[PDB]
């Protein structure tokens, strides 16, 4: 019945430095358990009974704490450690997990690359028109999209999907797609997708015209 | 050694029931506790219950009664979990888990993704995405392949039958009223396109579809 | 009679990381004392006799050292710790303080917002004319102002006042005001206040015209 | 518990004298040492001296003789400090301080701000600051209220009688030949101004002034 | 015969923070030795027999490790520590060194200043023509140069020389020089040297014309 | 105390031999091991061998036989090293080194730079670099002095006979087919040039050259 809060929610650390992750319990807890989950894979046990390590766990992970405050410490951050980490408790059945500390790998500031695509003739045949705007290779994850039709902003019918952090260059990529009807698409001419990133206040602008 | 195999995905309409299994090997099944965990997109891990086959002990999470009924087959070999109710709330990844006594887990199963939806199995579409009329800025050209309106997951998207893989960003699908929408981007130099052939290939096992779409210049 | 130098003078640290502050004495000292002063409040005793903590002091502050070199260490930096910290000595009567280590809270680079205001008609009635240029929300504190009248720079009669770091967004704000007479104001037309910040080499320029 | 109350501010001309006090409660006054500390803008903390009322022990900083004469009233209750000389050098914040023996301090007093100036008490002015003729760039409009030529400190500046407080930057006053100059900025959206009324309110207790100035569009 | 790899190759650390440098051996080693070499000076022994310090070595350097993995740790980084550090081994005769961990001092991002110079009349007398482009004061060291003649890029005959990190402002400077013949120089008119730095994606461009 | 002095630079053609020496003082020469180390630009430190004069023990690196022949003169005083082969591979800085037994070093010598080249000793040129025709952007003007085609190293470049040193960047020379090329930049304000005289001074000891070139405006 105990509620476990893991802090912070999103971690950003560079390879080769000390990493301290913390979990906090509502009331007194006797033993703590930690779990690692890499993207697209089953979770695994790292630490059991507050401090002891599981078999197969590399010598860099450490755990400590008591009562309400507990910590998982990584002495030296490695590339294969970029994963989500979870709190785990008992002596209160349930038997609950934490929110999940997402350890993300640090990268030097990256600027997004934008490519806007007009709706295909095959979709315009069916009666639908989806304008796809690709936002590729940027750091960090947080970014804002703004669809502008003839200057006026559009909010409904927008689809936004992000990718997980890349294993090679450690950058994020997202796909922005606005869905419209054949009638709604042909009424207007200019279509713009704007990217508002932390790297620059000036929006990265890619646009096209329908009549052309 | 210790392996907990469980089926890929189950797709069942609201109201009806599902029987999940977990083929356990690498250890003595009747010795260690078997636990079950539910994981949702952005809500975290939720523990359901656990069975000891010994000594038959069946624990449950109070929030999961009586949505889950846990039983164990011992011959053969597996641990069973029946979900009775089935609602849109139930749509999640369900994990098998081994543990030595209450209440922590050593090894986790492959995980079965359960999708509770009234939607029917449907074939994909596949559309070619070509750059602006004229030329692309710089030296690197960007191409795309849009797959709209398909159920269920997944779809295998490969460029040039498997000859093109470098600089490819495949974006995860999103639910849009019963049918999924997936997109993928590829970045190559201007000396390769449109001098050489580039084709996006999509296959859907649930509908037996094989689409090869060539990106023609506008 | 001992001179105590605290180093560094201005500290910049992000929440949740180790903070080491140092004080250095001219000659041998037996015991050291540390004092915390939050903006707009009376100072208080943190550490007494080099290492012992005062009553009411949160468990994160620590002290150590000997002879000439002494240190105050904060194991984990919190938001309510952004204050000025002072050295304190005896066995040499006086009985002197250090310069004062100003612990400022760290924030992601912020760009200044500029708003220039023409002198009010009420002041122009009296015979004075003050052109006020507000520089709002920027990080860090260090910034340069440049008043330009018709292109030519003005240096005398300039008033510059800074604010303390904000509790919510952790940004600095300053007020630039040039005072002129009614005769000096009406002789020229163009009035410009330029902001030279670390964030961008290009000055943030806001200007107006008198005749308009 | 332990509280060391002392008056707000004292304003005395050069040449004359000041008698500072410190009302002590929460502990036995005659048991613990009483210290006095002077703090200047950008020069740091400077210790002046300390009295023990027991056992009457009065220590002094050699640099502060005989500018300060320390005495203690024990009935009532307070610790006194007379500054004899008074120059522009003396203008600083003077702190009361409790301590157990020489030579460190546990609890500090509220602090009395002393201003040594030949200037006379004067009423404020208050001026409305309006943006450029036409329109403001963006969606957020910026307004100001300039208070020029007042003595002494402080001045309480509030927007809309206390209804507006979010996004307000009040800038500390600076000394400009006997009379202070203070400014304050406020950032609000264009849908509120000039559709709704915005008024800056300034009150000066030393001159009994109450000014409400409305920012009219140019 | 043992190969010693020092990691990382180039270190970047700010003054007043913990510095951990590591050397890795091919096989088991009994004792380790470390060497400091400041630019334009003879190397010197810092640590002998894994942990013991040499005479004259300041109290901030530390060493530890065993078998294959060994470390040199600097507790607090100082300005006079910016040097190359080398691994050293025996019990395997040779008797080999590591690659060399270059400890460089950290500085706040600096933008390059470019000055392009036309070939002197004294060199044009001989028949040669060298166009010199100076790139001064930038951080960090990594930068790209691009010579453009009338728009077209030139690659052969380019000479690039870097300086060591400055002791005062901690910035790098490089000299780019393209050598051409009198015939090759007079055939074209426009000459451009472009600087591609990490600070800005936009190249810093300085150019001139021959006929002018 | 302990000093290991060795000559500046040696310049010998391919095929012939070099005899390096190391004048040792500050300690008993016949007590501590003498080691020799070769350092190349971007390849790291390479140990060559070591002699004990006691007890005459001469160790060698297997990769350095028989390119190096180590001998010791004990009177006088020095440790000798003869390089027999000499190729373009040998061009490096050779270090003297003291150590107590095998196999680490306490004190290092000044280092002798050896250049194996078929090139002949040649005089420098010196050229004045003036900014663009007209004016320079900003307030700070930039001047240069290009020295092209000289052998061997080094060259001493000073501005205004030694009166100008602030804001001067002297760039290391690079090998360009037998003859070196060196450049230096200087940043000064527009009020000094061309109002005052600025002159770059270059001296080459191997050719006995002294050039003073004045930068005239274009």
Residue numbers in the entry:
A (entry chain E): 2001 to 2212
B (entry chain F): 2001 to 2218
C (entry chain G): 3001 to 3212
D (entry chain H): 3001 to 3218
E (entry chain C): 1001 to 1212
F (entry chain D): 1001 to 1218
Reproduce, without paraphrasing, sentences from the article in which this PDB structure was first reported.
Chikungunya virus (CHIKV) is a mosquito-transmitted viral pathogen that causes fever, myalgia, rash, and severe arthritis in humans. The E1 glycoprotein participates in cell fusion, whereas the E2 glycoprotein binds to cellular receptors and initiates clathrin-dependent endocytosis. Most neutralizing antibodies bind to E2, as this glycoprotein is more exposed on the viral surface than E1. We also describe pseudo-atomic resolution structures of CHIK VLPs complexed with Fab fragments from four different neutralizing mouse monoclonal antibodies (MAb CHK-9, CHK-152, m10 and m242).
Four cryoEM structures were determined to ∼15 Å resolution of CHIK VLPs complexed with the Fab fragments of the neutralizing mouse MAbs CHK-9, CHK-152, m242 and m10. All Fab fragments bound the VLPs with one Fab fragment per E2 molecule. The crystal structures of CHK-9 and m242 Fab fragments were determined to 3.0 Å and 3.1 Å resolution, respectively. These Fab structures were fitted into the cryoEM maps of the corresponding VLP-Fab complexes. The coordinates of the E2 B domain in the VLPs did not agree well with the B domain density in the maps of the VLP complexed with the CHK-9 or m242 Fab fragments, suggesting that the E2 B domain had a different orientation in these Fab-bound structures than in the non-complexed VLPs. The footprint of CHK-9 and m242 Fabs onto the VLP localized primarily onto the domain A and did not include any part of domain B. Indeed, binding of these fragments to the VLPs had nudged domain B ∼10 Å sideways, out of the way of the Fab fragment. All four MAbs examined here bind to the end of the trimeric spikes that includes the putative receptor attachment region, although only the CHK-9 Fab footprint actually overlaps the site. Nevertheless the proximity of these footprints to the possible receptor-binding site could probably allow neutralization by competitively limiting access of the virus to the cell surface receptor. However, to block receptor attachment it is necessary to block all three receptor-binding sites on every spike. Such a stoichiometry would require substantially higher concentrations of Fabs to inhibit infectivity, as seen with CHK-9, m10 and m242 Fabs. In summary our structural studies suggest that the CHK-9, m10, and m242 Fab fragments neutralize CHIKV infectivity by blocking the cellular binding site on the A domain of E2 and that the CHK152 inhibits fusion by stabilizing domain B of E2, preventing exposure of the fusion loop on E1.
